[model samples]
Target: AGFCEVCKKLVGYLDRNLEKNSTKQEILAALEKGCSFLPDPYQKQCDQFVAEYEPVLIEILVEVMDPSFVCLKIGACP
Candidate 1:
């Protein structure tokens, strides 16, 4: 694998998995597992990557836990 491959695949692991009852810890665990192969610099990049996305993961998990939050796939908001 190359430098960009780490960036590419590392980012891909952060995609939304729209299932019921998913948690931030689940995504975070998967993220750590996914990026564990890289060394310090690359690993540091992965940590930053996870840090950035952890908030997104939290937001999404919060939405999923919301009973009233509609989970539709509508297009861009007007």
Candidate 2:
């Protein structure tokens, strides 16, 4: 589904910005910035996903940091 694609893309964006010293706020900002650049429905989806799962997404980004794993964790890839 499209949510799965958006999930992977957002996770990939997070993974790209990840650093050993990156703070949650920094990561979150990066995610927001990335979402801002997306076009149309994906942008809306991204915003809603972030709004609903900001904490979870940040946790996954800091820990797992894998698009596939992130998607699976949220059931977006299933």
Candidate 3:
């Protein structure tokens, strides 16, 4: 099956920055650009996307104290 709209958005997010690692600032900028595109009524889409990946991301970056900070800041988390 194809990805949901939210997942497509997530894929796009990942693709844009696939070449290099992203800094907090770069992540913020991308989030800002994308947030404007998200419909307020569909916030749950983002909520799910973040919830699904946040744990995985945290596992990889053991030093990350709060993964939600970046995930949410970038409009991926609720």
Candidate 4:
């Protein structure tokens, strides 16, 4: 439950930083950067979340470049 929310928020952060041609490396970097912007438990949760799902997140983000789609694909959103 919390993780799903964190996942969505993280995806939103990534979506904000991403460009049409954003590369995997950039997305990975953005993920790290985005975590810093989160507050308290969310920041910690984001780190753990990324640690667990980075690969899947990168794959989906690279293909779709859509936050909502990414969240749904990852089952973070209904």
Candidate 5:
């Protein structure tokens, strides 16, 4: 209610799925090389591209700066 449309969704996703995002360093190392504008910088592998890029794409879509749906989480969300 307080935030805009984008921020609401972003916050909601982050809150509910934060666990899914945690502990992704190794995953990042494997997926950053094949996608993103800064590809090939993730260690010496190319499998971690998806793990790294997916989160960023979600962020862009949610618009954290301005969210909506004041209450997105059931408990400790985002």
Candidate 6:
């Protein structure tokens, strides 16, 4: 089932969003220009997004550590 409008907005906050400074067309253009590779965390988010939105992306997996940083970032542990 689709999410409610409020829930979708909340979800958008967790994931990246189109920057107001960057128009949607500009954002798409940027994605096209710079998506040759992605950092592990970002790549994981991509995989998760794909699997959730496109069944074909199910072949990949995503991982993240959000409670605290790992190695200093989101994956870091204290």
Each candidate: what lDDT? 0.46, 0.77, 0.46, 0.80, 0.34, 0.29
Global lDDT of model 3? 0.46
Q: What does candidate 4's lDDT look like per residue over 1-78, in tens digits? A: 547888878888777767867898998888878888877778888898888888899888887767667778877666
Of candidate 4, the 10-residue stretch with the lowest lDDT total is: 63-72
Q: Alpha carbon lDDT of residue 54, candidate 6?
A: 27
Error of 5 at 63 (Å): 19
1 against 4, candidate with superior TM-score:
4
For model 2, state the Cα shift of residue 67 in Å: 0.8
lDDT of 2 by residue, 1-78 (tens): 647888888878777766746778887888777787666768888888778777787776666777888889877788
lDDT-based ranking: 4, 2, 1, 3, 5, 6
- Model 5 TM-score on a 0 to 1 scale: 0.23
Q: Any runs in candidate 6 off by more than 4 Å, and if so which?
A: 1-20, 37-78
- Better structure of 3 and 6 per TM-score: 3
Those runs of model 3 whose alpha carbons end farther than 4 Å from true positions after fitting are: 1-3, 17-19, 23-37, 57-78
- Residue 45, candidate 6: C-alpha displacement in angstroms: 11
What is the TM-score (0 to 1) of candidate 4?
0.83
Top-TM-score candidate index: 4
Model 2 lDDT-worst window of ten: 13-22
Which tens-of-lDDT digit does each residue in 1-78 have in candidate 5?
A: 222233344333344534444344523342232233223443222223233334653433243312232323311124
List runs of model 4 lying over 4 Å from the truth.
Answer: none
What's the count of clashing pairs in each model shown?
0, 0, 0, 0, 15, 5
lDDT of 6 by residue, 53-75 (tens): 32211111122212122122211
C-alpha RMSD by candidate, in order:
9.1, 2.0, 8.8, 1.6, 12.7, 13.3
Error of 6 at 16 (Å): 11
